[PDB]
């Protein structure tokens, strides 16, 4: 479940808490 392709579905560049 790495940041690779939820990013984009919840924020590009939404690493920290968001």
Same mark, same amino acid.
Do not use: C, D, S, T
């Given at each position: @479940? &790495? $940041? @690779? @392709? $939820?990013? @984009? =579905?919840?924020?590009? &560049?939404? =690493? =920290?808490? &968001?």
């Amino acid at each position: @479940r &790495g $940041l @690779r @392709r $939820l990013g @984009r =579905k919840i924020a590009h &560049g939404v =690493k =920290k808490y &968001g």
